[PDB]
C-alpha cells in the first residue's frame, strides 16, 4: 500500500545492486591509477583523491541519514 | 468539506511518500558521486553541492513555512 | 445582492483554498529541487528563483492591493 | 429618459461589479504565477507582464477618458 | 449489470495486456539507449531518465490509487 | 489468444533480432573510437563511456526485470 | 530469413571493410604524429595514446564479445 | 480472381520498380552529403544516419514480414 | 517499358552530371579552406574532414551497392 | 548540351577567378601576420600554419583529383 | 570584365595601402620594445622576433609567389 | 494551328522576358546581402546559397530539358 | 514595347538608387563597428567580414554577369 | 527627385550626427579602460585594440570609398 | 536642433561626471595596491602599470582628439 | 469632373493627415523601444529596424513615384 | 478640423503622458539591474545597454524629426 | 487627472517599496559572497563587482534624471 | 500595509537565519582549510583570504548601509 512503497522497494534493490557493483569499479580504477602514476602520467595526490572518494562512497547511507534528518 | 480539503490531503500524502523515497535517491547519488570523484571524473566541490542540496531538501517544509507566511 | 456579490464570495473561497494548498506544493517543489541540485541536474540559482517565487506568491494579495488601486 | 440612460446605468453597474471582482482574480493569478515560477515552469518576465496588466486594468477608466475625448 | 461493468472489465483486460507488453518495449529502449550512449550520441542522464520512467510505469496502479481517492 | 499475445510475440522476435545485431554495431563503434582516440580527436573517457554503455545494453532484460516489477 | 539476417550480413560486411581500411588510417596518423613530434609541435605521450588506441581498435571484436555477453 | 489479385500484382510491380530506382537516389544523396560535409555544412553523424536509413530501406520487405505476421 | 525505366534513366543521367560537377566544387572548397586556415580562421582538422568527405563522395556508388543489397 | 555542361563551365570560371584572387589574399594575410608576430601578439607556429595552408590551397585541384577518383 | 577583375583590383589597392601603412606600425612597435627592454620588462630575444617578423612581412608577396605556384 | 501553339508562344515570350529581368533582381539581392553580411546580420553561407540559386536559375532550361525528357 | 521592358527599366532605376545609397550605410556600419571593437564588444575578424561584404557588394553586377550567363 | 535622394540625404545627416557623437563615446571608453588597466582588470593590448578601432572608425568614409568602387 | 545635439550634451555630462568620479577610484586602487605589494601579494610592476593607466585615463580626450580626426 | 477627381482629392487629404499623424506614432514607438531595450527585453537590431522603417515611411511618395511610372 | 486633428491631439497627449511615466520605469529597471549585477546574475555590459536605451528614449522626438523629414 | 497620473503614482509607490526592500537583498548577497570567497569558491573581484552594483543601484534615480533629460 | 512590508519582514527573517547559520559554515571551512594546508595541498594565503571573507560577511549590513544610501 501507501502508493509509493513499491517504488521505494525497487529503489532499495537498485541501491543494493549498485553497492554490490561498486567495489569492483573502485578496484579497477585503483589498478589503472597505480600504473598511470608509475608511468609519470598523474600525480601522487590522485591516491588521496581516490581514498576520499571511496571512503565517502562506503558510508553514503550513513552520511545521508546524518544530513537528511 | 471546504471543497479542496480532499486535494490538500492527497497532496500531503504525496509529499510524505516523496519524503520517504528521497533518502534512498540521495544515498544512490552520493554512492555514484564518490566513485566518480575517485576516478577523476568530477571535482571536490561536488560533495559540497550535494551536502547543500540534501540539507535544503531535508528542511523543505520549514523553509517554505518561513518564507510563505 | 448587487448582482455579482455571490461570484465575488465564490472567488474569495477559491482564493482561500488555493492559498491553503500552495505551501504543500512549494514544499514538494523545494524537496525535488534540492535532490535535483544534489545530483548535478540544476544550478544554485534555482534556489534564488524559488525563494523569489514563493515570496511573491505569499504576498500576492498585498501586491495586488498596492498596484490595483 | 434620453432612450439609453437606463442601458448606460446598467453598463455602469456592470463595470463597478467587474471592477470589484477583478482584484481577487489578479491575486489568484499572481499566487499561481509565483509558484509556477518557483517550479521552473515560467520565466521572470511574467511578473513584469502581470504588473503591466494590473496597472493598465486599474486605470482603465482614466485611460479611456484620455483617449476617447 | 451496472451499465458500465462490461466496459470496465474490457478496460481492465486492456490494461493487463499493455502491462504485459511494456517490459519488452522497455528492454528494447534500454538496449538502443546503451548503444547510443556508447556511440557518443546521447548523454549519461538518459539512463536516469529511463530508470525514473520505468519505475513510474511499474507502479502506475499504486500511484493512481494514491492520487485518485 | 488473449488479444495481444501475438503483438507480444512480434515484439519478442524484434528484441531478439536487435540483440543479435547489436554486437556488430558495438564492435564497429569501438573500432572507430580507437582510431579517433589515436588521432587525438577524442579523449580517454570515451572508452569508459563505451564500456558503461555496452555493459548496460548487454543486461537490458535483467535491469528491466529488476526495475519493472 | 529471421527478418534481420540480411541487415546483419550487411553490417558484418561493413565491419570487415572498415577493419580492412583502418590500418592505412592508423599508419598515416602515425606518420603525421612522428613528424609533428620531431618539430616540437606535440609531446611524447602522443605515441602512448596512439599505441593504446590502435591496440584497442585491433581487438574490438574480442572486447565486444567479452563485455556484451 | 479473388477480386484484389490484380491490385496486388500492380502493387508488387510498383514495389519492384521503386526498389530498382532507390539505389540511384541513395547514391546521389550520399554524393551530395559527402561534399556538404567536406564544406563544413553538416556533421559527421549524417553518414551514420544515411547508413541506417539505407540498411533499413534495403531490407524493408524482410522487416515487414517479421513485423506483419 | 517497365513503367519507370525512363525515370531510372533520367536519374542515372542526373547522377552522372552531378558526379561530373562535384570535383570542381570540391576543388573550390579546398581552395577556400586552405586560405581560411592560413589566416587562423579554422583549425587543422578541417583538412581531415574534407578528405573524409571527398573520399566518401567519390565512392558513393560503391558504398550504396555494398549497403543496399 | 549534356544538361549541366553550362553549370560546369560557370563553376570552372568561378574557380579560375578565385584562384586568381587568392594570392593577393595570402600576401595580405602574411603581411599582417608578420607585423602581429613582431609585436608579440602571436607565436612562431603561425608561419608554419600559413605555409601549410598556402601550399594546400595551391595544389587544391591536384589533391581533389588524387582523392576524388 | 572577367567578373572578379574589379574585386582583384580593389584587393591590390588594399594591399598597397596596407604595405604603405606597415612600416610606421613596425617602427612604433620597435620604439616601444626598446624602452620595454631597457626597463627589464622583456628579454633580448624580442629583437630577434621583431626582426624575423618584419623581414617576413617585407617579402610577403615574394614568399606568396614562391609557395602559391 | 495545333490549338495551343499560340499559348506556347506566349509562354516562351514570358519566359524570355523573365530571364531578361532576373539578372537585375539577382544583382540587387547580392548588393543587399553583401551589406547585410558586413553589418553582421547574416552569415557567410548566404553567399553560397545565393551562388547556387543563381547558377540553377541561369541553366533552368538545360536542367528542365535534362529531366523532362 | 516587349511587354516587360518598363519593369526592367524600373528595376534598373531601383538598382542604381540602392547602389547610390549603399556607401553611406557601409560607412555608418564601419563607424559603429570600429567603436564597438574599441570597446571590447566584438572581435577583430569583424573588420575582415565587413571588408569581404563590402567588396562583394561593390562588384555585385560583375559577379551576377559571371554566374548568370 | 531621383526617388531615393531624400533617403540618401537623411542617411548623410544621420552619418554626420553619429560622427559628431562618436568622439565622446571613444573618450569615455578610453577613460574607463585606463582605470580598468590600472586596477589589473584588463591587459596592455587593450590600448592597442582601442587605437586600432578608433583609427578605423575615424577614416570609415575613406575606407568605404576605397573598397566600394 | 540637428537631431542628436541633445544626446551629445547628455554624453558630455556623463563624461564630465565620470571624469569627476575617476580620481577617487584611482586613489582607492592605489591605496589597495600599496598594501598588497607590502604584503608580498603582487610585484613592483603593478605601480608602473597603475601609473600608465592613470596617465592614459587623464588624457583620454587628448588622445581621442589626436587619433579620431 | 473626370469621375474620380473627388475621390483622388479625398485620398490626397487622407494621405496628408496620415503623414501628419505618423511622426507622433514613430516617436512613441521609439520611446517604448528604448525602454524595452534598456530592460533587456529586445535586442539592438530593433533600432536599425525602426530607422529603416521610418526612413522608408518618410520617402513613401518618392519611392512610389520611382516604382510606379 | 482637418478631420484627423483630434486624433493627433490625443496622440500628443498620450506621448506626453508616456514620457512622464518613462523615467520611473527606467529608474526601477536600473535599480533591479544594479542588484542583479551585484549578485553575479548579469554582466557589466548591461549598464552600457541601459544607458544607450535611456539616451535613445530621451531624444525620441529629436531622432524622429531627424529621420522622418 | 491627465489620464496617466494614477499609473505614475502607482509606479512611484512600487519604486519606493522596491527601494526599501533592496538593502536587505544586497546585505544577504554580500553575506553569501563573503562565505563563498572564504571557501575558495569565487575570486576577489566579486567584491568590486558588488560594490559597483550597489553604488549604481543606490543612485538609480539620479542617473536616470541625468541621462533621461 | 504598504504592500511590500510583508515581503520585507520575510526577507529580514531569512537574513537573520542565514546570519545564524553562517558561523558554522565558516568554522567548517576553516577546519578543512587548516588540514588541507597541513598536508601541503594549498598555500598560506588561503588563511588571509578566509579572514577577509569572514570579516566582510560579518559586517555585511554595515557595508550595505554605508554604500547604499
Ligand atoms: C621517458 C619516459 C617517461 C614516461 C614513461 C613511459 C614511456 C613509455 C610507456 C610504454 C607503454 C605502451 C603501452 C602501455 C600503456 C601504458 O603504459 O599506460 C598505462 C595504462 C593507462 O595509462 P594512461 O591513462 O596514462 O594512457 C595514456 C594517456 O595518458 C594518454 O593521454 O594502464 C593499463 O592498464 C595498460 C594498458 C595497455 C594498452 C592496451 C589496452 C587494451 C585493453 C583495455 C581496453 C578495454 C576497454 C575498457 C577499459 C576501462
Ligand atoms: C610526500 C608527501 C606529500 C603530501 C603529504 C600527504 C600525503 C598523504 C596524506 C594522507 C591522507 C589520507 C586521508 C585524509 C584526507 C586528507 O588528508 O586531505 C585533507 C581533506 C581534503 O584534502 P584535498 O582537498 O587535498 O583532497 C584531494 C584533492 O586535492 C584532489 O585534488 O580535508 C578533510 O576534511 C579530511 C577528510 C578525510 C576523508 C574522509 C571523509 C568522509 C566523511 C566526510 C564527507 C561529508 C561530505 C561534505 C563535507 C563538507
Ligand atoms: C557520475 C555522477 C554524475 C551525476 C550524479 C547522479 C548519477 C546517478 C543517479 C541515480 C538516480 C536513480 C533514481 C533517483 C532519481 C534522481 O536522482 O533524480 C532526482 C529526482 C528527479 O530529478 P531529475 O530532474 O534529475 O529527473 C530526471 C531528469 O534528469 C530528466 O532529464 O527527484 C526525486 O524525487 C527522485 C525520485 C526517484 C524515482 C522514482 C519516482 C516514482 C514516484 C513519483 C511519481 C509521482 C507523480 C507526481 C510527481 C510530482
Ligand atoms: C589515467 C587514469 C585517469 C582516469 C581514471 C580511471 C581510468 C579507468 C577506469 C575503468 C572503469 C571501467 C568501468 C567502471 C566505470 C567507472 O569507473 O566510472 C564510475 C561510474 C560513473 O562514471 P562516469 O560518469 O565518468 O561515466 C562515463 C562518463 O564520464 C562519460 O562522459 O560510476 C559507477 O557507478 C560505475 C558503474 C560500472 C558500469 C556498470 C553499470 C551497469 C548497471 C547500472 C545501470 C542501471 C541504470 C540506472 C543507473 C543509476
Ligand atoms: C569520432 C567518433 C564520433 C562518433 C562515434 C561513432 C562513429 C562510427 C559509428 C558506426 C555505426 C555504423 C552503424 C551502427 C549504428 C550505430 O552505431 O548507432 C546506434 C543506433 C542508433 O543510433 P543514433 O541515435 O546515432 O541514429 C542516428 C541518429 O544519429 C540520427 O541523427 O542504435 C542501434 O540499434 C544500431 C542499429 C544498426 C542499423 C541497422 C538497423 C536495421 C533494423 C532495425 C529496424 C526496426 C524498426 C524499429 C526499431 C525500434
Ligand atoms: C599534427 C597531428 C595532430 C592530429 C593527428 C592526425 C593528423 C593527420 C591524420 C591523417 C588522416 C587521413 C584520413 C584518415 C581519417 C582519420 O584518421 O580519422 C579517423 C576517422 C574519423 O575521424 P574524425 O571523426 O576525427 O573525422 C573528422 C572530424 O573530426 C570532423 O570534425 O575514423 C576512421 O574510421 C577513418 C576512415 C578513413 C576515411 C575513409 C572512409 C570511407 C568509407 C566509410 C564510409 C561508410 C559510411 C558509414 C560509416 C560508419
Ligand atoms: C610594451 C611592449 C609590448 C608589446 C609591443 C607593442 C606595444 C605598442 C604597439 C603600438 C601600436 C599602435 C598602432 C599600430 C597597430 C600594431 O602595431 O599592431 C599590428 C597590426 C594588427 O595587430 P593585432 O592583430 O595585434 O591588433 C590588436 C589585437 O592584438 C587585439 O586583440 O597590423 C597592421 O597592419 C597595423 C595597422 C595599424 C592600425 C591602422 C589600420 C587602419 C587601415 C586598415 C583598415 C582596413 C579594414 C580591413 C583590414 C583587413
Ligand atoms: C625554434 C624551433 C621550434 C619549432 C621547430 C620547427 C620550426 C620550422 C619548421 C619548418 C617546416 C616547414 C614545412 C613542414 C611542415 C611541418 O613541419 O609540420 C609538420 C606537419 C603538421 O604539423 P602541425 O600540426 O604542427 O601544423 C601547424 C599547426 O601546428 C598549426 O597550429 O606534418 C606533415 O605531414 C608535413 C606536411 C607538409 C605540408 C604540405 C602538405 C600538402 C599536401 C597534404 C594535404 C592533404 C589533405 C589530407 C591530409 C591528412
Ligand atoms: C593577429 C592576426 C589574426 C588574424 C590573421 C589575418 C588578419 C588580417 C587578414 C586580412 C584579409 C583581408 C581580405 C581577405 C579575406 C581573408 O583573408 O579571409 C579568407 C577568405 C574567407 O575567410 P573567412 O571565412 O574567415 O571570412 C570572414 C569570416 O571569418 C566571418 O565569420 O577566403 C577568400 O577566398 C578571400 C577572398 C577576399 C575577399 C574578396 C571576395 C570577392 C569575390 C568572391 C565572391 C563570389 C561569391 C561566391 C563565393 C564562393
Ligand atoms: C535580472 C534583470 C533582467 C530584466 C531587467 C528588468 C527587471 C525589473 C523591471 C521592472 C519593471 C516594472 C514596470 C515597468 C515596465 C518595464 O520596465 O517594461 C518596459 C515597458 C514594456 O516592456 P515589455 O515589452 O518588456 O512588456 C512586458 C513583456 O515582457 C510582455 O511579454 O515599456 C513601457 O512603456 C513601461 C510602462 C510601465 C507600465 C504602466 C503603463 C500604463 C499606461 C499605458 C497604456 C496605454 C495604451 C497604449 C500603449 C501604446
Ligand atoms: C572595464 C572596461 C571593459 C569594457 C570597455 C567599456 C566600458 C565603459 C563604456 C562606456 C560607454 C557609455 C556610453 C557610450 C556608448 C559606447 O561606448 O558604445 C559604443 C556604441 C555602440 O556600442 P555597443 O553595440 O557595444 O552597445 C551596447 C551593446 O554591447 C549591448 O549589448 O557606438 C556608438 O556609436 C556610441 C553611441 C552612444 C549612445 C547614444 C546614441 C543616441 C543617438 C543614436 C540613435 C539613432 C538610431 C539608429 C542608429 C543606427
Ligand atoms: C581543500 C579545501 C578546498 C575548498 C574549501 C572548502 C571545503 C569544505 C567546505 C565545507 C562546507 C559544508 C557546507 C557549507 C556550505 C559552504 O561552505 O559554501 C558556502 C555557501 C554556498 O557556497 P557555493 O557557491 O560554494 O555552493 C556550492 C557550489 O560550489 C556548487 O558549485 O554559502 C552559504 O550561504 C552557506 C550555507 C550552508 C548550507 C545550508 C543551507 C540550508 C538553509 C538555507 C536555504 C534557503 C534558500 C534560499 C537562500 C538564498
Ligand atoms: C611569511 C609571510 C608571507 C606573507 C606576508 C603576510 C602574512 C600575514 C598577513 C596578515 C593579514 C591579515 C588581514 C589583512 C589583509 C592583508 O594583509 O591583505 C591586503 C588586502 C588585500 O590582500 P589580497 O588581495 O592578497 O587578499 C587575499 C588574496 O590574496 C586571496 O587570493 O588589502 C587591504 O585593503 C586589507 C583589508 C583588510 C580586510 C578587511 C576588509 C573589510 C572592509 C572592506 C570591504 C568593502 C568591499 C569593497 C572593497 C573595495
PDB file of N, CA and C in Angstrom, chain O residues 7-50:
ATOM      1  N   UNK O   7      21.541  64.259 -27.377  1.00  0.00           N
ATOM      2  CA  UNK O   7      22.288  63.068 -26.987  1.00  0.00           C
ATOM      3  C   UNK O   7      23.756  63.392 -26.759  1.00  0.00           C
ATOM      4  N   UNK O   8      24.325  64.259 -27.598  1.00  0.00           N
ATOM      5  CA  UNK O   8      25.709  64.673 -27.406  1.00  0.00           C
ATOM      6  C   UNK O   8      25.885  65.427 -26.094  1.00  0.00           C
ATOM      7  N   UNK O   9      24.933  66.298 -25.752  1.00  0.00           N
ATOM      8  CA  UNK O   9      25.007  67.010 -24.480  1.00  0.00           C
ATOM      9  C   UNK O   9      24.925  66.048 -23.302  1.00  0.00           C
ATOM     10  N   UNK O  10      24.035  65.058 -23.387  1.00  0.00           N
ATOM     11  CA  UNK O  10      23.919  64.071 -22.316  1.00  0.00           C
ATOM     12  C   UNK O  10      25.212  63.276 -22.181  1.00  0.00           C
ATOM     13  N   UNK O  11      25.815  62.901 -23.311  1.00  0.00           N
ATOM     14  CA  UNK O  11      27.081  62.178 -23.266  1.00  0.00           C
ATOM     15  C   UNK O  11      28.189  63.036 -22.667  1.00  0.00           C
ATOM     16  N   UNK O  12      28.209  64.331 -22.987  1.00  0.00           N
ATOM     17  CA  UNK O  12      29.201  65.220 -22.390  1.00  0.00           C
ATOM     18  C   UNK O  12      29.016  65.319 -20.882  1.00  0.00           C
ATOM     19  N   UNK O  13      27.765  65.412 -20.427  1.00  0.00           N
ATOM     20  CA  UNK O  13      27.506  65.444 -18.990  1.00  0.00           C
ATOM     21  C   UNK O  13      27.975  64.158 -18.321  1.00  0.00           C
ATOM     22  N   UNK O  14      27.685  63.012 -18.940  1.00  0.00           N
ATOM     23  CA  UNK O  14      28.132  61.738 -18.387  1.00  0.00           C
ATOM     24  C   UNK O  14      29.652  61.664 -18.339  1.00  0.00           C
ATOM     25  N   UNK O  15      30.318  62.144 -19.391  1.00  0.00           N
ATOM     26  CA  UNK O  15      31.775  62.136 -19.420  1.00  0.00           C
ATOM     27  C   UNK O  15      32.354  63.008 -18.317  1.00  0.00           C
ATOM     28  N   UNK O  16      31.785  64.198 -18.112  1.00  0.00           N
ATOM     29  CA  UNK O  16      32.274  65.069 -17.047  1.00  0.00           C
ATOM     30  C   UNK O  16      32.073  64.434 -15.677  1.00  0.00           C
ATOM     31  N   UNK O  17      30.913  63.815 -15.452  1.00  0.00           N
ATOM     32  CA  UNK O  17      30.669  63.177 -14.162  1.00  0.00           C
ATOM     33  C   UNK O  17      31.624  62.011 -13.924  1.00  0.00           C
ATOM     34  N   UNK O  18      31.861  61.190 -14.949  1.00  0.00           N
ATOM     35  CA  UNK O  18      32.800  60.084 -14.797  1.00  0.00           C
ATOM     36  C   UNK O  18      34.217  60.591 -14.568  1.00  0.00           C
ATOM     37  N   UNK O  19      34.595  61.681 -15.239  1.00  0.00           N
ATOM     38  CA  UNK O  19      35.907  62.271 -15.007  1.00  0.00           C
ATOM     39  C   UNK O  19      36.034  62.764 -13.574  1.00  0.00           C
ATOM     40  N   UNK O  20      34.954  63.321 -13.025  1.00  0.00           N
ATOM     41  CA  UNK O  20      34.967  63.735 -11.627  1.00  0.00           C
ATOM     42  C   UNK O  20      35.127  62.537 -10.696  1.00  0.00           C
ATOM     43  N   UNK O  21      34.427  61.440 -10.989  1.00  0.00           N
ATOM     44  CA  UNK O  21      34.471  60.267 -10.116  1.00  0.00           C
ATOM     45  C   UNK O  21      35.825  59.565 -10.177  1.00  0.00           C
ATOM     46  N   UNK O  22      36.462  59.541 -11.354  1.00  0.00           N
ATOM     47  CA  UNK O  22      37.620  58.658 -11.559  1.00  0.00           C
ATOM     48  C   UNK O  22      38.739  58.852 -10.545  1.00  0.00           C
ATOM     49  N   UNK O  23      39.160  60.075 -10.184  1.00  0.00           N
ATOM     50  CA  UNK O  23      40.304  60.191  -9.260  1.00  0.00           C
ATOM     51  C   UNK O  23      40.105  59.465  -7.944  1.00  0.00           C
ATOM     52  N   UNK O  24      38.876  59.428  -7.427  1.00  0.00           N
ATOM     53  CA  UNK O  24      38.613  58.683  -6.201  1.00  0.00           C
ATOM     54  C   UNK O  24      38.875  57.199  -6.414  1.00  0.00           C
ATOM     55  N   UNK O  25      38.415  56.659  -7.544  1.00  0.00           N
ATOM     56  CA  UNK O  25      38.649  55.251  -7.840  1.00  0.00           C
ATOM     57  C   UNK O  25      40.136  54.960  -7.984  1.00  0.00           C
ATOM     58  N   UNK O  26      40.871  55.846  -8.658  1.00  0.00           N
ATOM     59  CA  UNK O  26      42.310  55.649  -8.807  1.00  0.00           C
ATOM     60  C   UNK O  26      43.014  55.688  -7.457  1.00  0.00           C
ATOM     61  N   UNK O  27      42.610  56.613  -6.584  1.00  0.00           N
ATOM     62  CA  UNK O  27      43.216  56.699  -5.261  1.00  0.00           C
ATOM     63  C   UNK O  27      42.938  55.447  -4.441  1.00  0.00           C
ATOM     64  N   UNK O  28      41.706  54.938  -4.494  1.00  0.00           N
ATOM     65  CA  UNK O  28      41.380  53.717  -3.759  1.00  0.00           C
ATOM     66  C   UNK O  28      42.165  52.534  -4.314  1.00  0.00           C
ATOM     67  N   UNK O  29      42.288  52.456  -5.641  1.00  0.00           N
ATOM     68  CA  UNK O  29      43.056  51.377  -6.252  1.00  0.00           C
ATOM     69  C   UNK O  29      44.503  51.427  -5.788  1.00  0.00           C
ATOM     70  N   UNK O  30      45.108  52.617  -5.791  1.00  0.00           N
ATOM     71  CA  UNK O  30      46.497  52.727  -5.356  1.00  0.00           C
ATOM     72  C   UNK O  30      46.640  52.400  -3.876  1.00  0.00           C
ATOM     73  N   UNK O  31      45.670  52.816  -3.060  1.00  0.00           N
ATOM     74  CA  UNK O  31      45.718  52.501  -1.637  1.00  0.00           C
ATOM     75  C   UNK O  31      45.699  50.997  -1.408  1.00  0.00           C
ATOM     76  N   UNK O  32      44.856  50.276  -2.147  1.00  0.00           N
ATOM     77  CA  UNK O  32      44.835  48.823  -2.012  1.00  0.00           C
ATOM     78  C   UNK O  32      46.115  48.195  -2.554  1.00  0.00           C
ATOM     79  N   UNK O  33      46.622  48.708  -3.678  1.00  0.00           N
ATOM     80  CA  UNK O  33      47.794  48.112  -4.312  1.00  0.00           C
ATOM     81  C   UNK O  33      49.039  48.276  -3.454  1.00  0.00           C
ATOM     82  N   UNK O  34      49.178  49.413  -2.774  1.00  0.00           N
ATOM     83  CA  UNK O  34      50.340  49.606  -1.922  1.00  0.00           C
ATOM     84  C   UNK O  34      50.419  48.581  -0.808  1.00  0.00           C
ATOM     85  N   UNK O  35      49.299  48.343  -0.125  1.00  0.00           N
ATOM     86  CA  UNK O  35      49.277  47.357   0.948  1.00  0.00           C
ATOM     87  C   UNK O  35      49.437  45.950   0.389  1.00  0.00           C
ATOM     88  N   UNK O  36      48.840  45.676  -0.775  1.00  0.00           N
ATOM     89  CA  UNK O  36      49.001  44.358  -1.378  1.00  0.00           C
ATOM     90  C   UNK O  36      50.459  44.084  -1.720  1.00  0.00           C
ATOM     91  N   UNK O  37      51.158  45.085  -2.255  1.00  0.00           N
ATOM     92  CA  UNK O  37      52.577  44.940  -2.552  1.00  0.00           C
ATOM     93  C   UNK O  37      53.407  44.805  -1.285  1.00  0.00           C
ATOM     94  N   UNK O  38      53.064  45.554  -0.234  1.00  0.00           N
ATOM     95  CA  UNK O  38      53.815  45.460   1.014  1.00  0.00           C
ATOM     96  C   UNK O  38      53.699  44.070   1.625  1.00  0.00           C
ATOM     97  N   UNK O  39      52.581  43.394   1.391  1.00  0.00           N
ATOM     98  CA  UNK O  39      52.347  42.074   1.931  1.00  0.00           C
ATOM     99  C   UNK O  39      52.813  40.921   1.075  1.00  0.00           C
ATOM    100  N   UNK O  40      53.640  41.181   0.063  1.00  0.00           N
ATOM    101  CA  UNK O  40      54.183  40.166  -0.834  1.00  0.00           C
ATOM    102  C   UNK O  40      53.105  39.438  -1.627  1.00  0.00           C
ATOM    103  N   UNK O  41      52.022  40.124  -1.991  1.00  0.00           N
ATOM    104  CA  UNK O  41      50.965  39.512  -2.785  1.00  0.00           C
ATOM    105  C   UNK O  41      51.057  39.841  -4.269  1.00  0.00           C
ATOM    106  N   UNK O  42      51.704  40.945  -4.634  1.00  0.00           N
ATOM    107  CA  UNK O  42      51.903  41.338  -6.022  1.00  0.00           C
ATOM    108  C   UNK O  42      53.342  41.814  -6.186  1.00  0.00           C
ATOM    109  N   UNK O  43      53.689  42.221  -7.402  1.00  0.00           N
ATOM    110  CA  UNK O  43      55.048  42.624  -7.727  1.00  0.00           C
ATOM    111  C   UNK O  43      55.125  44.126  -7.972  1.00  0.00           C
ATOM    112  N   UNK O  44      56.354  44.600  -8.184  1.00  0.00           N
ATOM    113  CA  UNK O  44      56.615  46.030  -8.292  1.00  0.00           C
ATOM    114  C   UNK O  44      56.172  46.623  -9.622  1.00  0.00           C
ATOM    115  N   UNK O  45      55.966  45.800 -10.652  1.00  0.00           N
ATOM    116  CA  UNK O  45      55.496  46.324 -11.929  1.00  0.00           C
ATOM    117  C   UNK O  45      54.054  46.801 -11.854  1.00  0.00           C
ATOM    118  N   UNK O  46      53.340  46.457 -10.780  1.00  0.00           N
ATOM    119  CA  UNK O  46      51.963  46.906 -10.629  1.00  0.00           C
ATOM    120  C   UNK O  46      51.885  48.423 -10.560  1.00  0.00           C
ATOM    121  N   UNK O  47      52.858  49.057  -9.907  1.00  0.00           N
ATOM    122  CA  UNK O  47      52.864  50.513  -9.822  1.00  0.00           C
ATOM    123  C   UNK O  47      53.101  51.147 -11.186  1.00  0.00           C
ATOM    124  N   UNK O  48      53.985  50.554 -11.990  1.00  0.00           N
ATOM    125  CA  UNK O  48      54.204  51.054 -13.345  1.00  0.00           C
ATOM    126  C   UNK O  48      52.928  50.923 -14.167  1.00  0.00           C
ATOM    127  N   UNK O  49      52.264  49.771 -14.059  1.00  0.00           N
ATOM    128  CA  UNK O  49      51.001  49.566 -14.760  1.00  0.00           C
ATOM    129  C   UNK O  49      49.962  50.594 -14.329  1.00  0.00           C
ATOM    130  N   UNK O  50      49.867  50.838 -13.021  1.00  0.00           N
ATOM    131  CA  UNK O  50      48.905  51.801 -12.498  1.00  0.00           C
ATOM    132  C   UNK O  50      49.196  53.204 -13.009  1.00  0.00           C
TER     133      UNK O  50
END
